[PDB]
A paper describes a structure:
The X-ray crystal structure of the HsdR subunit with bound ATP from the Type I restriction enzyme of E. coli plasmid R124 revealed four structural and functional domains forming a planar array: one nuclease domain of PD-(E/D)xK type that houses three endonuclease active-site residues and a QxxxY motif common to the RecB-like nucleases; two RecA-like helicase domains of SF2 type that use ATP to translocate duplex DNA without unwinding; and a C-terminal α-helix-rich domain presumed to contact the HsdS-HsdM2 methylase. ATP bound between the two helicase domains was found unexpectedly to also contact Lys220 of the endonuclease domain, suggesting a means by which nuclease and translocation activities might communicate.
In the Lys220Glu mutant the loop is less defined than in the Lys220Ala structure, although main-chain atoms of residues 216–220 could be modeled. In the Lys220Ala and Lys220Glu structures, where the residue 220 sidechain does not form a hydrogen bond with ATP, the helix-like segment is rotated so as to bring the alpha carbon of Asn221 into the position of the alpha carbon of residue 220 in the WT and Lys220Arg structures. In these two structures the Asn221 sidechain points toward ATP and partially fills the space that in the other two structures is occupied by the sidechain of residue 220, but the Asn221 sidechain does not approach the ATP base edge closely enough to hydrogen bond as Lys220 or Arg220 can. Although the helix-like segment is also rotated in the Lys220Glu structure, the region preceding that segment is poorly defined in all four molecules of the asymmetric unit, and the Glu220 sidechain is not resolved.
Residue numbers in the entry: 13 to 180, 192 to 583, 593 to 859, 873 to 884
The structure:
């Protein structure tokens, strides 16, 4: 029974008042009651404890006496030193408690029955009446076996769900899933032990298998809140990893997973194994959670008792710190960039183990070397997470040859079509049918990935002919000090990056954390040239001004469309080797670490560097092919490109910036120093329809300045200059306040201003416009600096002075007034303050 429905009929309103929180709550409780959720009246933690006692006793076929129960409570269930983290761990891992009764016998007491879900007892309660007058806080808590695992916060129809989210006894530490609703929109998100919380962007709507949203509370309840559905989401489709972070799977992920599982069961039952028709593939756009989903799918696949072994296969190219840190718990030291099959062979012979994590390289090697493995004759499941074409063909040939009974499943954001095939077989031919799909279109619609802002930066007349070169032969022949690597070109590019880095990364505003960036270059010589030029120029600027703060720059490359670079550094030539050695030397000098250039030390360098780019310890990372595919860094907002990128390689490269973070990150920045427009549009069109480019790619500076109309619902979006104009006209401060109507309009309009400027900071033209506002005067000398740096003609310079912007003081006044109106509203339904932007 799929918990993500292929077909669902939208439920009809009752006709009764749906306006207030009490209405939503009343109909919610009634609905749940009709779905098998018993409503118990429980007004206290003592009552809760009594109920938990009864439900656990019933579940485990056991009986506590007051002393025994008090002990179980104090030691396991309710111990005071337990936090949210401890309860989450207890639910997902430690849920079995070995308990010694007073008569000294030992029994295993389950909090949840994970093998049979429907045996678990589900109930609902409502909020406690507390004390003197504050209120409202209308909530409904879903208890599993007495444990308060789910919390639904309710708001009235008018309230914007986003602001409601922004607004926010030991047993409630057990809360796993949160749900929030105004009844029009219902959004769920995981409970967290963080010390830095997630944002609204991570909250998810429930949906059907075609990814179409399910919004209103009635349908959310009729679908997501079905006991089978809900309990599956809590138990099977929630992830508690080695980072001890709770991740609730988005609907498309669950759909893909359960469709794979059903596919395996059906293929086994029919003895249809070892064909493409016994397998499947999953198309999930880059950045949509393929790793999490595929891995969870493998894990669940091990729970099929007819399946002997489950391979989870990844590319070393797609590896980073957290992933390798995670896989350690399953197949220790068997997952790395080496060619060694020893760890893999040890995993194969490991008792009480099904799951086997490995790399496509190691798997291919094993299949070549070993003729008759026992596992060849077993019941096998292969789960491939984004495995590039490099070793994949050969590995597939050997796989088809040696493995007798198998079900193989692909996971990719960029399937192999005939169009982009390039020597490789189509995904469809390899894996057979497509079990599920979540396209870049749906992903942008659901705001689970970021759009692209792609610009070819053309300030360089001398090299423009080269950067725009279509011919592939000329392109290939142009990499050298004569054409592409020309010192002037490299110098200009580097200088641009140095000048605009803080702008593109949102480090502009004073006291802003911001983001970091990557630089994808064409070759090893390109990496050398760029690193050297960056060093030189940063030194020069440091000598010019004492206040200048340098950007920490690292680089990584190996021997080696994106060419796979191995982890063996012996394959490199002496010059590249020397440069890498020096770079790693400086990396060591600054970060006070010791990394050698031998394969092990270089792998350590890879991992540590990954972690340091992820946490922003490194400002700019220069790579050739590395960290362009599977690398996950939510705080990386910009990809600088001087490289030839086509199709799948282009999508994967650009997608390093696509991860959602918060309102501060509007989209990914792709700044290209060769013209990628045709390549971009071709790629996007291949992975979507003809219209996909009008979704994925951001709008123009002119559009955001003067306003534009969105194709989807026809919503006319006001321009930045219109917002400014109306701010000056209708509210030139402080006297627009105190009145409440004017307060509301000001909040709305200035909200639009904030979002608009936040979007506009990524545009070079806006950067130029804002830079023009110092200057002065004259002092020319002050003009030629600005013009040469911002690449501005006398004509353009003359025009830019016509443009009239509010003073910094007026903007700060608006921001403080905004802050005060925000602080005033604690003690207006549809209004949403921008919380992240004010931070
Ligand atoms: N259900 C979820 N809840 C919260 N966060 C999620 C969820 N699924 C994915 N993420 C986050 O989204 C980011 C991308 O996930 P992941 O690395 O699996 O993407 P991917 O599609 O495998 O990567 P790529 O396509 O770039 O190789 C990660 O930082 C992950 O924590
Ligand atoms: Mg992945």
């Amino acid at each position: 029974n799929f918990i993500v429905l292929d077909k669902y009929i939208k439920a009809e309103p009752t006709g009764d008042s749906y306006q207030s929180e009490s209405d939503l709550e009343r109909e919610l409780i009634q609905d749940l009651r009709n779905q098998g959720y018993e409503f118990i009246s429980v007004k206290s933690q003592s009552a809760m404890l009594a109920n938990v006692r009864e439900q656990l006793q019933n579940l485990n076929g056991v009986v506590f006496n007051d002393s025994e129960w008090r002990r179980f409570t104090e030691q396991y269930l309710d111990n005071p030193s337990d936090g949210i983290l401890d309860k989450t761990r207890k639910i997902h891992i430690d849920y079995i408690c070995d308990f010694i009764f007073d008569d000294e016998r030992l029994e295993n007491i389950y909090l949840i029955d994970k093998k049979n879900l429907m045996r678990n007892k589900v109930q609902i309660i409502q909020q406690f009446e507390q004390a003197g007058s504050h209120a409202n806080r209308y909530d409904v808590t879903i208890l599993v076996n007495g444990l308060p695992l789910v919390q639904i916060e309710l708001k009235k129809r008018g309230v914007a769900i986003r602001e409601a989210f922004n607004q926010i006894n030991s047993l409630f530490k057990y809360l796993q899933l949160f749900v929030i609703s105004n009844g029009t929109d219902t959004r769920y998100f995981a409970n967290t032990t963080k010390r830095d919380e997630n944002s609204f962007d991570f909250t998810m709507n429930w949906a059907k298998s075609d990814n179409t949203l399910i919004k209103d509370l009635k349908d959310f309840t009729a679908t997501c809140f079905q006991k089978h559905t809900l309990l599956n989401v809590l138990v099977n489709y929630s992830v508690f990893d080695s980072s001890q972070t709770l991740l609730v799977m988005r609907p498309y992920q669950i759909a893909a997973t359960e469709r794979i599982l059903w596919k395996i069961k059906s293929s086994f039952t029919a003895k249809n194994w070892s064909k493409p028709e016994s397998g499947g593939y999953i198309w999930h756009t880059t950045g949509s959670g393929k790793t999490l989903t595929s891995f969870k799918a493998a894990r669940l696949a091990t729970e099929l008792d007819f399946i002997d072994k489950v391979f989870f296969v990844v590319d070393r190219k797609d590896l980073d710190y957290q992933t390798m840190k995670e896989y350690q718990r399953f197949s220790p030291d068997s997952v790395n960039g080496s060619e060694n099959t020893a760890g893999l062979k040890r995993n194969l012979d490991k008792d009480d183990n099904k799951i086997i994590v490995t790399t496509i390289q190691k798997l291919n090697n094993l299949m070549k070397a070993e003729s008759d493995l026992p596992v060849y004759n077993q019941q096998v499941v292969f789960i491939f997470d984004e495995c590039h074409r490099s070793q994949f063909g050969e590995a597939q040939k050997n796989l088809k040859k040696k493995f007798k009974r198998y079900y193989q499943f692909g996971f990719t954001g960029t399937p192999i079509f005939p169009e982009n095939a390039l020597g490789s077989e189509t995904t469809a031919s390899v894996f057979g049918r497509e079990l599920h799909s979540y396209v870049i279109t749906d992903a942008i619609r659901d705001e689970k990935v970021l759009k692209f802002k792609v610009d070819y930066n053309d300030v360089r007349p001398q090299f423009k002919s080269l950067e725009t070169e279509t011919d592939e032969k000329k392109l290939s022949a142009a990499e050298n000090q004569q054409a592409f690597l020309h010192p002037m070109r490299i110098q200009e590019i580097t200088q641009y990056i140095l000048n605009n880095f803080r702008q593109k990364t949102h480090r502009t505003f004073p006291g802003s954390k911001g983001f970091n960036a990557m630089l994808a270059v064409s070759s090893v010589d390109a990496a050398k040239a760029y690193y050297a030029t960056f060093k030189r120029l940063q030194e020069e600027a440091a000598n010019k001004s004492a206040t200048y703060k340098p950007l920490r720059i690292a680089t990584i490359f190996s021997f080696a469309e994106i060419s796979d670079e191995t982890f063996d550094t012996s394959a490199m030539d002496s010059s590249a080797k020397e440069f890498l050695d020096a770079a790693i030397r400086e990396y060591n000098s600054h970060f006070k670490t010791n990394f050698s250039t031998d394969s092990n030390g270089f792998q350590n360098y890879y991992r540590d560097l990954a972690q340091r780019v992820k946490n922003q310890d490194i400002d700019l990372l220069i790579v050739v092919g590395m960290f362009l595919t599977g690398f996950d860094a939510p705080t990386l907002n910009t990809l600088f490109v001087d490289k030839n990128l086509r199709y799948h390689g282009l999508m994967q490269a650009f997608s390093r910036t696509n991860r959602i973070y918060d309102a501060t990150k509007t989209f990914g920045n792709i700044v290209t120093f060769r013209d990628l427009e045709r390549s971009t549009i071709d790629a996007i069109t291949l992975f979507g329809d003809k219209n996909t480019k009008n979704v994925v790619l951001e709008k123009s500076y002119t559009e955001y300045m003067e306003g534009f109309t969105d194709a989807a619902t026809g919503e006319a979006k006001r321009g930045f200059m219109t917002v400014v104009s109306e701010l000056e006209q209708r509210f030139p401060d402080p006297t627009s306040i105190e009145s409440e109507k004017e307060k509301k309009d000001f909040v709305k309009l200035f909200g639009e201003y904030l979002r608009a400027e936040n979007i506009l900071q990524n545009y070079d033209e806006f950067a130029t416009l804002k830079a023009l506002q110092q200057i002065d005067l004259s002092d020319p000398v002050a003009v030629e600096k600005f013009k040469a740096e911002h690449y501005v003609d006398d004509e353009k310079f003359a025009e830019l002075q016509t443009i009239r912007l509010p003073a910094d003081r007026k903007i700060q006044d608006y921001r403080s007034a905004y802050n005060d109106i925000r602080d005033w509203q604690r003690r207006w339904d549809d209004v949403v303050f921008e919380v992240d932007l004010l931070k």
